[PDB]
Amino acid sequence: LLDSFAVDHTRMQAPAVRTAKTMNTPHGDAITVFDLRFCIPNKEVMPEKGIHTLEHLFAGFMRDHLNGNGVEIIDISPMGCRTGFYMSLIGTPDEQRVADAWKAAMADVLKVQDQNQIPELNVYQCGTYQMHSLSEAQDIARHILERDVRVNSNKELALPKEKLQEL
Amino acid sequence: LLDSFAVDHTRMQAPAVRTAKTMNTPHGDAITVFDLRFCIPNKEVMPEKGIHTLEHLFAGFMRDHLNGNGVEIIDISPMGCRTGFYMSLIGTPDEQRVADAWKAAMADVLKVQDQNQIPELNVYQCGTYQMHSLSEAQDIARHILERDVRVNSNKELALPKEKLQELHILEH
Ligand SMILES: [Zn+2]
Ligand SMILES: [Zn+2]
Numbered sequence: 594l595l596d597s598f599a600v601d602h603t604r605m606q607a608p609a610v611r612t613a614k615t616m617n618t619p620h621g622d623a624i625t626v627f628d629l630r631f632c633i634p635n636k637e638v639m640p641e642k643g644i645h646t647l648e649h650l651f652a653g654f655m656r657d658h659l660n661g662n663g664v665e666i667i668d669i670s671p672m673g674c675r676t677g678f679y680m681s682l683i684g685t686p687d688e689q690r691v692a693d694a695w696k697a698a699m700a701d702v703l704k705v706q707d708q709n710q711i712p713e714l715n716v717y718q719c720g721t722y723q724m725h726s727l728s729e730a731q732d733i734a735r736h737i738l739e740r741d742v743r744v745n746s747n748k749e750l751a752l753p754k755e756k757l758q759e760l
Numbered sequence: 761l762l763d764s765f766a767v768d769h770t771r772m773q774a775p776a777v778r779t780a781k782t783m784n785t786p787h788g789d790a791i792t793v794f795d796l797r798f799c800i801p802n803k804e805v806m807p808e809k810g811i812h813t814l815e816h817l818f819a820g821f822m823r824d825h826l827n828g829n830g831v832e833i834i835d836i837s838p839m840g841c842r843t844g845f846y847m848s849l850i851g852t853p854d855e856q857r858v859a860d861a862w863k864a865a866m867a868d869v870l871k872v873q874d875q876n877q878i879p880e881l882n883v884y885q886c887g888t889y890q891m892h893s894l895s896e897a898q899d900i901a902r903h904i905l906e907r908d909v910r911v912n913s914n915k916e917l918a919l920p921k922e923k924l925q926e927l928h929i930l931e932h
Contacts, residue, residue, distance in 0.1 A: 641840075
């Protein structure tokens with residue numbers, strides 16, 4: 594992520610919410626990008642099909658539970674390392690509010706009955722429509738609820754001078 | 761909140777730039793999300809390692825070429841279907857401007873010699889630091905330059921109301 598805090602992924606707990614970046618707009622509004630860490634870095638990874646199916650569901654369900662009262666979601670997208678999603682939004686909700694909405698969204702994934710209920714899962718509306726698994730998406734959502742969602746601190750995970758050097 | 765678009769992926773050309781969505785902040789700043797389509801839907805995909813390595817390089821290089829003169833990038837991230845990236849930014853640059861910066865960025869990927877020039881490629885800064893391939897990232901960047909980058913029209917790719925019913929009507 595562009596212009597982010599530099600945090601130590603070997604100490605990063607998951608699942609967890611973290612402020613990856615804040616930004617101002619020209620007329621003074623706030624934009625926050627959240628690190629929604631599903632998996633512990635370099636120990637766990639979400640599978641490709643599940644993460645894609647989850648991507649189709651996550652944005653809507655997150656909007657259902659998070660939009661309004663000063664918050665407007667711009668986009669939720671997967672991380673290329675496959676350990677989480679970045680969520681960019683207008684507003685400055687606190688991390689526990691995001692964590693509660695995220696958990697509520699994972700619950701919603703569990704009630705999805707069939708690949709047929711999934712928004713835009715067809716050749717006309719998905720770039721790679723074969724690359725899907727509702728059961729994998731549900732396993733991921735289920736693991737988030739089993740593990741709960743911590744709040745991570747940028748202060749606690751900050752890389753010290755010594756370790757940045759060593760790189 | 762201004763405009764988002766449901767477009768027909770069976771007719772979508774790539775590589776191409778397209779305005780996926782526009783939004784306004786409370787005090788009236790425009791936010792645009794661009795569909796940066798690398799691959800033709802359901803005919804090509806980028807590979808997992810190359811797309812990740814590309815992700816480490818793309819945001820910086822795009823900033824180098826696109827930021828300023830009214831534009832500030834928020835984030836560039838991969839699509840789960842692996843046919844492109846979404847780029848969210850502050851501002852309303854036109855699609856050809858984004859296409860030129862994107863091409864310039866792909867050129868930059870080509871001059872990356874070995875991975876030591878790849879930012880944050882280590883266990884302390886990357887979620888899955890073995891899942892990388894510079895040669896794959898360079899094949900992707902090269903393909904974009906070989907194919908060039910078109911501007912896609914939302915009006916042209918619009919799914920009509922009838923077809924969306926038909927598809928909404930196979931929800932639940
Ligand atoms: Zn898709
Ligand atoms: Zn990484």
